[PDB]
Design a protein around this ligand. Structure first.
Ligand SMILES: *Cc1c(COP(=O)(O)O)cnc(C)c1O
Ligand SMILES: *Cc1c(COP(=O)(O)O)cnc(C)c1O
Lengths: 411, 411
């Protein structure tokens, strides 16, 4: 018996792959072979799951974010507000469309973009905001939508770490103008690599299709197609490139989606258990869950600690101790990563592909200051969601480990 | 008995997929699970196949072209020469890096970029050329390399339609500074979606890795990795995004690569047979194969006809007749598509993501004039490579069909 690992599959996953082989259609750009593509089947299923009208699968979360921006007409001379604490893609997607990402610090108890700091970052160039529902929390969409409405700004939800979360009875991604998701191996819904884009607007739906299929859209009626006909047809309303997801991946996502809500329920149940237990340890502070959140998807379970009460340990050392005591990998228990502006992987100034005006210089980005997002990697622990799938008796070990470590520093 | 179809797979393909499931590592960004990734295994195999030092798999042919340009430092203010007759990606990849694609017509008997027209298109802004080995021919690399050397220009080979072709004992893609390939469903080496980048330069190799893995590169030594360790590590010499190929696709490509050279040999053998037979029909002109080509990979078999000798038929009508007589789908027998500048899918002016200076206007592109590439779609027939895998007796039917049609217009 060991800790739950990730990814996870079953014979159902295998059968979906076999279905792709049987259809002999490996791409949506391939021709019709008799029945609907895995892409459309997944898109329809995910649309119902999110209670959103339109869904367009794509290649990755990074590309989903990029196309979302393109669909909204964002480009050179524009500014896009994003949180400092998130994966660098949230910011590089902006640079990819020739726009300038503008960082805003996150809230101390949610690690999501601080609404009260967004207003000060708005300029005449600001065109949109990309809130990120980080780890196991949601950005305050009540506040964000209010700011967006008042300042005429678009909203793109980066839901790569929150498939299925619910804010005021709306699934994450359906709240903003366009929702973007990642299906990379570590995420709760994955096919190794993959992306998803959702929107409520019909026009954006057509634009997004074209943006990912070299300016093409689905034919008028797929029920009329005969074996050998193309399902994608020319449109040309907006220039796109090839960002189509392979049928093999759409098939795996279809399979994984079948158990997504239930597994999320299990993770959430265990997360609350941890909140109850861990919150009773002096010096330990769990994240603050807003009343508006009725369902929280935990891509990562996060809890913070007071170094003053824990022998001055940094998150790295804290995690090392826990991992040795619980015998779990670094991939499953570790501190949050560095904020984007300080992250070595974020280095815009290194390539000519980026406009000189937006890539700036190393000093410009590295010199930015966002206290909360910066201190996060030094005093908080992240538990990968796979662990949240373990039996309660096993999770207790984690709580005991933290308790033991606390008793050691208790004077 | 019917015509060969595409894609094609066997139990070997299935076993590779099963290996991915067994490893439980679905992405190269996932952690090490004991043995080498499918990505590295494929990269190594393809490198040996191409006799090229470095190979980096990616998401698509379009993205492969784009990253190749980024790796070479191409950006705003630059011009890149590309042929007018090719898939639009060859040109949109340039626009994707903020550079301006500059069209040059193709040769009447090869449909590949005319070397003698490139010189006139060179300006002080020109930084590179992207020759395309279109359908079943190769661009004249002797001439192109000479021009590139004299004008200090980089060369990127678009090999999406020529996996395995050989010019003067060098596989297509290994000749220029960087080679780009597509593994989309219709290509000779496919996994539904997929891309490949190859290069002889060590520095470019590192840059390309970072460009497709969020600024990361492979660890120093994979033999030291333990189960749970990450194989990708930070580098930060150049800004990249996530363009990693899923393990499922690398596995299928590994399988398909096993029989690529032999199937290409079969296609080539049949292509020559068609050249011999069809060339004996008055009004039919096969493509001209250069002496430098020792191995020609036929993604598409092309032959042209003289409308004057064929009742004034256009390629569309010619193909319709053949398809009805041979009973084969539109996907397998059809005329070449429109040149990029006239292609409805090519519409740069429609999105703000592109610099105003490079997207120009509809009239600017649509108003371009490239005679040869334009007449191609009206008087030539393209046979998909799958058909070139049929038994010789079956191909004879195609020759007979063309002969019958010719006898009908013979006065
Ligand atoms: C994983 C992730 C991404 C990017 O998705 P990819 O599939 O890796 O391209 C973007 N934003 C967040 C918050 C993510 O967690
Ligand atoms: C197919 C193709 C591409 C693009 O590859 P994708 O995998 O479709 O992105 C580019 N150039 C040529 C010549 C192609 O045939």
């Amino acid at each position: 018996d060991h800790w739950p690992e990730w990814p996870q599959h079953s014979d159902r996953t295998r059968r979906k792959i076999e279905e792709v082989f049987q259809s002999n259609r490996w791409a949506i750009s391939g021709y019709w072979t008799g029945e609907e593509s895995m892409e459309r089947k997944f898109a329809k299923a995910f649309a119902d799951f999110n209670g959103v009208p339109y869904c367009v699968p794509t290649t990755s979360g990074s590309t989903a974010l990029m196309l979302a921006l393109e669909a909204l007409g964002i480009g050179e001379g524009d500014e896009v507000i994003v949180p400092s604490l998130t994966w660098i893609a949230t910011a590089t997607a902006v640079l990819n469309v020739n726009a300038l990402p503008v960082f805003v610090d996150v809230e101390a108890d949610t690690y999501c973009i601080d609404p009260q700091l967004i207003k000060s970052a708005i300029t005449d160039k600001t065109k949109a905001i990309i809130p990120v529902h980080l780890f196991g929390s949601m950005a305050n969409m009540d506040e964000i939508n209010e700011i967006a409405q008042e300042h005429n700004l678009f909203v793109i939800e980066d839901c790569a770490q929150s498939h299925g979360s619910v804010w005021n009875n709306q699934r994450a991604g359906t709240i903003g103008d366009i929702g973007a998701f990642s299906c990379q191996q570590g995420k709760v819904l994955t096919a190794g690599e993959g992306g998803i884009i959702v929107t409520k607007n019909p026009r954006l739906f057509e634009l997004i299709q074209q943006l990912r299929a070299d300016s093409r859209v689905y034919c008028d009626d797929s029920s009329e197609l005969m074996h050998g006909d193309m399902q994608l047809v020319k449109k040309g309303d907006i220039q796109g490139s090839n960002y189509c997801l392979s049928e093999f991946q759409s098939a795996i996502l279809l399979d994984q989606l079948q158990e997504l809500d239930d597994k999320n329920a299990i993770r959430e149940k265990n997360a609350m258990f941890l909140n109850d237990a861990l919150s009773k340890i002096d010096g330990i502070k769990v994240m603050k869950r807003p009343p508006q959140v009725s369902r929280q998807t935990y891509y990562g379970y996060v809890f913070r600690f007071d170094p003053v009460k824990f022998g001055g340990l940094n998150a790295d050392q804290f995690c090392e101790i826990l991992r040795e005591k619980l015998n779990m990998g670094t991939f499953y228990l570790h501190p949050p990563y560095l904020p984007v502006h300080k992250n070595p992987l974020f280095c815009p100034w290194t390539k000519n592909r980026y406009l000189k005006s937006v890539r700036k210089t190393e000093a410009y980005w590295r010199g930015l200051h966002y206290p909360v997002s910066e201190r996060a990697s030094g005093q908080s622990i992240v538990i990968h969601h796979a662990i949240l799938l373990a039996e309660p008796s096993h999770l207790s070990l984690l709580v005991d480990a933290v308790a033991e470590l606390a008793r050691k520093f208790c004077v």
